[PDB]
Design a protein around this ligand. Sequence first.
Ligand SMILES: OC[C@H]1O[C@H](O[C@H]2[C@H](O)[C@@H](O)[C@H](OCCCCCCC3CCCCC3)O[C@@H]2CO)[C@H](O)[C@@H](O)[C@@H]1O
Ligand SMILES: *C(=O)/C=C/NCC(O)CC=O
Length: 265
Amino acid sequence: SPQPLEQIKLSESQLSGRVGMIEMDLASGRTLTAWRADERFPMMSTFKVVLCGAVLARVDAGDEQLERKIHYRQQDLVDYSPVSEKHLADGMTVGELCAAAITMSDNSAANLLLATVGGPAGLTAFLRQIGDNVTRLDRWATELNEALPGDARDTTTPASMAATLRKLLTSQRLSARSQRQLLQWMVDDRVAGPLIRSVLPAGWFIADKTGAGERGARGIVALLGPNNKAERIVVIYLRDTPASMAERNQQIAGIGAALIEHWQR
Ligand SMILES: OC[C@H]1O[C@H](O[C@H]2[C@H](O)[C@@H](O)[C@H](OCCCCCCC3CCCCC3)O[C@@H]2CO)[C@H](O)[C@@H](O)[C@@H]1O
Ligand SMILES: *C(=O)/C=C/NCC(O)CC=O
């Protein structure tokens, strides 16, 4: 594979879409590779990691409990609720809802959690509280993936999302237990984790949350590194490409291949 930046450019050319990417040292925040890092991209389901960061902050403050059982109804369900549709009778705990939202991309679980933090506006206020003045959530689970051209709703930038993920996982804004929990939910992703491991060389750590939307929108927020360590945050978003899901997945994997082959920088 060519150098990371060269591969990212080739991906735009081949997809006829915009790619946004940041490679950041998790421990220090040093930005290593950046491309359209300050441009806007729909977050799609990747917003679920920030959502659970807001939930964890409420737990730390004594305003929420991961054990709290939420009983919900069938009319509360939205498109794609693999886990939540199975618990209409017994409900799910707040912690279970976060595991479902992050590890299975369960949309109803995400919406139930979103309401507890004050809806899209409340999650946006949490982002401003931790110093992210760019990322914004405006709609609910299904509707936020529309990715209309030029629509700033439900967007982030690679740079803001990477900085926000680092703040949630390592800045001590969240308690030690909460930082560990958020990381473990990413490590446990069932949608893409196993698939990524199947193509990663031996020795590489992966934790992640992916997302997809209209007009080719696709994205992943991840922790990656050799020697089985979460060395760097890697955020890649794609938008406005007519390419098949398979080719968008392949182009993202290709950027990963470039990073892996040329990791020392
Ligand atoms: O010399 C480096 C490596 O070259 C190949 O590894 C390939 C691997 O066989 C292929 O499957 C992968 O595709 C890339 C898979 C990327 C997976 C996901 C990346 C995500 C993770 C973080 C966020 C963005 C993308 O590339 C590597 C590097 O060329 C060899 O198979 C491997 O033994 C060797 O150690
Ligand atoms: C999180 O990103 C959920 C996205 N749902 C929309 C789709 O999966 C459709 C992608 O083509």
